[model samples]
Target: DTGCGELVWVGEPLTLRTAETITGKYGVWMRDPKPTYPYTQETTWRIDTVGTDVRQVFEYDLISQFMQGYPSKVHILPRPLESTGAVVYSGSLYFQGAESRTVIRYELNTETVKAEKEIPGAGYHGQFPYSWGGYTDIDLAVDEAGLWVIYSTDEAKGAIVLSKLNPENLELEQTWETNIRKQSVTNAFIICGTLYTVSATVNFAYDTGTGISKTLTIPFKNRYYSSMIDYNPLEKKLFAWDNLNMVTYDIKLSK
Candidate 1:
């Protein structure tokens, strides 16, 4: 299921119709110094929509308080058999004097959260320094198998480490390393047991079992910056979105 280095846009792009625009706020103790976030700051974590009629909205504090960690971002893994929601692989290091950062999984319907997993900040050490300034970036994706956590300190050369998680308990199952290095990776997802990433105008794929990698240069300009990508296995379609527009494309894989 590969294409000749081109993505064919499906039907006319659908514009989201909603009365209220989604918004959020983020502040670490290093920056804000406020006793409580969300109350002093404002953030929106999730918003449920049926047809533009905002059904429900999950604020930052509401979810963060439960996990006891402040998340930088969240990814939704849509599944049929199990309850699906956000998988936050990285968050603030201000976890009441914990050594490393933590990951969180939030169930959308019930607003339940799990923060049992922790990701070390070793790579971002020295530069960021112990819950001080900025932190390293952690990318996450979930497929039928489970969740994946990708992180790296080799930004200039594009080297990275990958970790697979058990979907049931969110525990570390396996780890892999990639030689391919590129920066500004906007989003990542898994399909057919392979991990795929959209980094700056280029697409990268890494096989967990074989360690083989494939790359494709997108013909368009920067399309994935500040965006997220999701794959629909049922329809064999790929969706990507930024703040303003949402686009869909057919996934053509080549062997």
Candidate 2:
């Protein structure tokens, strides 16, 4: 997403998928928001192999037809919490003319809100002062141990707050203070228990076991300010996607 939340892609595809009413956007799994109250459901698209060198792609399902349970509300930012069989939904809650960002854990199989925690002092500002004012940008990621919440705070030049959470109980386990600028960070993920963040010019990695941080200068060819980076664990590849291109890197770790 870029420039006021517009979805952009590069080149033309063999076939373009379109929805009659829904907008084409990010491909992450989402809980549909237009169902009857309390019965909102999750849905996503899938691509399956039909033949040798051939694939069959299915349209995004509005309702989870095969899933047993449904989530109560729409998950604007949804991620699967792997430790437990639940999905994590998080974003700022806007109501009563105020905003309070929170982390909400929900079980899709059981259809329940397992845990809820309001992040104190979270958001771009104390409040939405005006329509064009900034608000806190919060992000979540997972590692071998548990989940983590990354948010911006005023500490260092561009300080950020990192809080570890227990995936089993959704409890805050520990917190780390760092100078990572939230606005400059384009993507973050965990690899082999280390948290790495990608910025415009440099990539930083934090090792919890040693309590040490390392930085590496990003190559000019890979310096994408608007792209988000992700790691494919099974394939052991790092991926970055921008509006015009998609790139992948094969990473190797040394002992």
Candidate 3:
């Protein structure tokens, strides 16, 4: 799928009540980068990243069929996840190890940890957050270039640090340090190879290729006060969790 463009505009919600608020708790729900075996076009997944013991994952062939408080299948992670920064691609779930900067790749097909690695000196467990606090220190994302991570470090003085990760071995291939303060923004997402940090509205993009950042006036709605905003390369849409509300916004990119 084609990736990365200057996000011209964000469209309104396409699906509704994608998740149960359960009295309004923040959580994340998303689809795969593309259709994989058993996981079809409408195969939906969700995680209630609210409590310390959060580990249950829900899967659905179609999100509309979620009822009876049951799913096609539910998998409990071997370990707890740190935050809402979880990405599923290549049939594996990539998440940050709880309370640390360690990245874990859990293969869904086999239900086992494929690989895990700690990002040296990277802050976790709320050492740094994107203006919104949730211990979302080790945010992982996928784009045209595959798996990437957005985080902050003491060495970088809490500035946003981007790292390209090997999706298989969970190794850091490269990194770029941005000038934006981690705690100064609402959250971030990777488009193409650029890092876009969001506050209330404006999207500040940091291009990894040039090690430079440009401010763009993209009027993104943080309605419902979205906590997790992640990009899916296959659908070219942003999967977001807005204060227990799960929705997606259409994305238009440049050529």
Candidate 4:
């Protein structure tokens, strides 16, 4: 196994035929890249981030049940989860609590708040969301490096502000204020240590490791829209909610 590599391109999304709560048009579903007890690579988790309940996280015993639309366990979050930007990382769920700049880390096994922290001055509840908008103002992401928060600040004047967080205590370690306007992209994710934003098309990147922005002009094959898009380091694939279906994208990384 090698170290973190740059994302080369993302392939077309392959749909999953699961229906149920996931049938809702707006939601997010994924697997824990660094899975813990009772959850192997085959284990999965889903969050239907719609309606009056955005806190129920469905945990599947196997990929078998994930496709069958049946969850082995439904772990209701201790707090309200805002949108599709919730990330299941290292055995916990990281998300923007309700409609605020605060991010909460909930332990899936224990059903408790492991840690919580607010991004000082970060926009929330559509103050500066992506072009697609959701309550996605405080997007939490996981990558080859670690956990990250992608959002904008009034101080930055609505530009993209990327911050690295200590996953355990949710401490703010470092931050990068990129020039790209927050409302310009569709969704953003972390690959290696670089930030990539999708407009349902072209891949615009900002490397926190280098503080450089580059355009890859990558062709993303989504006929229309996506409610969410998240990258998992374990398989190096992207799991996302497209339209009203659950889809996955195979990705390539540089050598």
lDDT of 2: 0.40
Taking the tens digit of each residue's C-alpha lDDT, what string does model 2 give over 1-255?
111111111122111222222111111122222222333333322211111221112323343432322223333223222110111222111111113465666443344556566655555332211111123245455433446666655543345566777654556787776656656555565565566765543367666566677776543235223233444343344544333233445555444
Better of 1 and 4 by lDDT: 4
The predicted structure with the larger TM-score, 2 or 3, is: 3
Off by over 4 Å in 2: 1-99, 124-136, 155-157, 200-202, 218-250
Residues 1-255, candidate 3: write the lDDT tens digits. Answer: 255577777777554554555532677677778556878767777888877877888887776654334678898999988788899888888988777788999988679999999987898887887677888888899897899989999999999998999989988999899999989888889988888877856568888988888988888876566788898888888888887677788888886
Clashing pairs in 4: none
**Residue 127 in model 4: shift from native, Å?**
0.3
Task: Give the candidate number with the greatest TM-score.
Answer: 4
The residue ranges of model 3 lying beyond 4 angstroms of the native Cα positions read 1-4, 18-24, 66-69
Tens-digit lDDT track of model 4 for 9-65: 778888874445543677888888888886787888888777655768888888888
| lDDT score, candidate 1, position 73 | 43
What C-alpha lDDT do the candidate models reach, one value each? 0.41, 0.40, 0.81, 0.82
Output the worst ten-in-a-row residue range by lDDT, candidate 4. 16-25
- TM-score for each model: 0.53, 0.53, 0.93, 0.94
- Backbone clashes for every candidate come to 9, 3, 1, 0
Cα lDDT of candidate 1 equals 0.41
